[PDB]
């Protein structure tokens, strides 16, 4: 992080929050991981 | 673009898509560079294409 590189993946999801926001080191939950329930990963191409 | 179809993106589902998500990804390019001597021409390369 020292050198402007962060690990791990990243996230997209829209929060309407007001409060406090760090992107950097989140407080809260991670919202799904990618084996988690309902959620689904795309195949080649993201094929629409 | 022509010689590659494994090459294509994808974007929409194209009739041509339906086809070329079929692809199998490691079917391109060389496949044996038989080569025999360093910082000479290779003699027989083996490329699907």
Redesign the interface.
Known sequence: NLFNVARGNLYLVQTATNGNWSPMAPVAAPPFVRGGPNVRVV?????? | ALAYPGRA?????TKN?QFL?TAIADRIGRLDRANLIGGEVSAMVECME
């Open positions: 195949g080649r191409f993201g094929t629409i | 993106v994808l974007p929409t589902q898509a998500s």
